[PDB]
Design a protein around this nucleic acid. Structure first.
Ligand SMILES: [Cl-]
Lengths: 250, 249
DNA sequence: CCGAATTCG
DNA sequence: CCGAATTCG
C-alpha cells in the first residue's frame, strides 16, 4: 500500500540479565505491530539468532557479527533488498558505524540507515562528528532515493544547535509531527528501571530523520513501544522503541 | 633543651604489597631519628599491632582502630600523655576525622593534631571543609598551649586560597622556612615508584601547621624521610615522611 | 593515590 | 546508559 511503518529500538544486548525473556518480549512487539522495517541497535550474536527463530518473517541485515552492533530487519513479502554498505566512523572508540541498506518498498526506492552514535556525556565531540557524517551521507545519497535514518543518537538538544541544526532538507519526524509529548522521551529512568538508576533522567536519544521530495514522505504517527513490563519485572530494554507510520504519495 | 622533633608520615597501610617489609622499614627510620612525636596516617590494625611491638619506646594513641585510621606516637620518658579527643568530619565519605592529643613535653603544654583529609581531586569541596574544621580547632585551643597539626592534607594548589588562606596566627612550617625545595614534594611518582603510576605527578600533600605566639615557636629544620629503598625493591611508603625540629622559646 | 576506563545502584 | 565510585598501569 501507500503507507509504510517501522520500529527503531535499542534493545540493550549488553545487559545480560533476562536477555532470553527480553528478546522474546521484543519479538512480541514485532508480532503485535508487524512493521515493514525494524532498526535495532545493541544487538549481540545470540540476540541475533533469537530473532531468526521468533521473527522469521524478517530478513536481517547487520552492520557486524561480533561484539555489539546494529541491524535492519526487512519484512519478507513487502520489502525487497537491493544492496547494503557500512560507512565506518574512523574515530569511534566504541565500534560504532553507519549501516546503509537500499531496498524497494511499495514500488518506491528507499535508503534505510541506522547507527548507534557514540555514548555518554564525555564523548560529545565524537558524537557530533558522527552526526555530521550521517547527515552528510543522507544528502549525498542518490537524488532518486528517499532516505530514512532511525537510530540511537544519544543526542542532547544543545549538541544539535552546536552542530548547526538539521539541514533544510532533512526532517526530524517527531519535530514534523509537532513535538508531541507522549513519545518525547525514549530513555527515561523514572518510568523504566532496567538499569537500576535511582535518579530520574529522561532524554530523546532515539530519533528518526528523513530526506524526501517535497510532500512525498509524510509522517502520520509516533508511539512508544516496549512499555509492557515482562514476567521477570523488567522491560525489554532500558530504551523505549519508536513506532512510526508514514504515508508515501506518488 | 627547649626543642621538639616530630615526623608525619602517611605509611599507606592500604597498600598490601610488602607491608611487613615496609613496616620494618618505617620502624627502622623512626629509630634512626628517634623523634619525640610521630603522626602516622593510613595505619591499619595489624600495622598498629606491629608498631606496639617494634616501636615499644612509643605510646600509640589511636581512635577507632577500625578500617584505616591515623595514630600519634609519643616517646616514653619525653612526652607525658594527658588526654585525647576525636573530632568528626560529619560529611566525610572516607571515614576521616581529626585526632587530637594533649601532652606535656619539656614542661610545655602541646595540643598535637593529625588527620588524613579527603582524597582525590574530585572531593576538593569536602577537603576544604575539613581544612576549615582543622584550622577551627587550632584557633579554639587554650592560648597557653602550643598547637601543632601534622598530617596528610591532600591539598592542591589554589585550594588553600579558595578556602580563604591561613589565619594570621597559624603558620605552615614549610612556608615559614622559605619554601625550601629540598623537601617540597612529599608525594612524587617520579622519585617514588610504589604505586607504579607511569606519569610524573608531584604534590606537597603532607603539611605541618602550628599556632604559636609571636616568636614563641621557630621551625629549625624540615627534611624528607623514608628515602631509602628497601631490600624488596620498594619504599616504606608512596609518601615521603617529614622530619621537623622546632625550638620553643 | 594520578586519572582514564570501567563498574554499578 | 546517569554519574559517583572503583580500578589499575
Ligand atoms: Cl506495565
Amino acid at each position: 500500500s501507500s503507507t509504510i511503518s517501522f520500529i527503531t529500538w535499542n534493545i540493550d544486548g549488553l545487559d545480560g540479565c533476562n536477555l532470553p525473556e527480553r528478546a522474546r518480549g521484543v519479538c512480541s512487539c514485532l508480532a503485535l505491530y508487524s512493521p515493514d522495517v525494524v532498526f535495532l541497535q545493541e544487538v549481540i550474536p545470540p540476540y541475533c539468532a533469537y530473532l531468526k527463530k521468533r521473527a522469521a518473517s524478517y530478513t536481517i541485515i547487520t552492520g557486524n557479527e561480533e561484539g555489539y552492533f546494529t541491524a535492519i530487519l526487512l519484512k519478507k513479502g513487502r520489502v525487497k533488498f537491493k544492496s547494503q554498505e557500512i560507512i565506518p566512523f574512523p574515530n569511534t572508540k566504541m565500534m560504532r558505524n553507519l549501516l546503509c541498506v537500499n531496498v524497494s518498498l511499495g514500488g518506491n526506492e528507499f535508503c534505510l540507515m541506522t547507527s548507534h552514535l557514540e555514548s555518554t556525556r564525555e564523548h560529545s565531540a565524537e558524537r557530533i562528528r558522527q552526526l555530521k557524517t550521517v547527515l552528510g551521507k543522507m544528502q549525498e545519497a542518490p537524488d532518486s532515493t528517499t532516505v530514512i535514518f532511525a537510530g540511537d543518537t544519544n543526542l542532547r538538544d544543545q549538541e544539535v544547535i552546536k552542530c548547526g541544526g538539521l539541514p533544510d532538507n532533512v526532517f526530524d519526524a517527531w519535530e514534523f509531527l509537532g513535538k508531541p509529548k507522549h513519545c518525547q522521551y525514549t530513555w527515561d529512568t523514572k518510568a523504566n528501571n532496567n538499569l537500576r538508576i535511582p535518579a530520574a533522567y529522561k532524554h530523546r536519544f532515539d530519533r528518526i530523520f528523513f530526506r524526501a521530495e517535497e510532500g512525498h514522505l509524510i509522517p502520520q504517527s509516533l508511539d512508544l513501544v516496549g512499555l509492557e513490563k515482562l514476567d521477570c519485572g523488567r522491560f525489554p530494554s532500558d530504551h523505549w522503541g519508536l513506532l512510526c507510520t508514514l504515508n508515501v504519495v506518488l
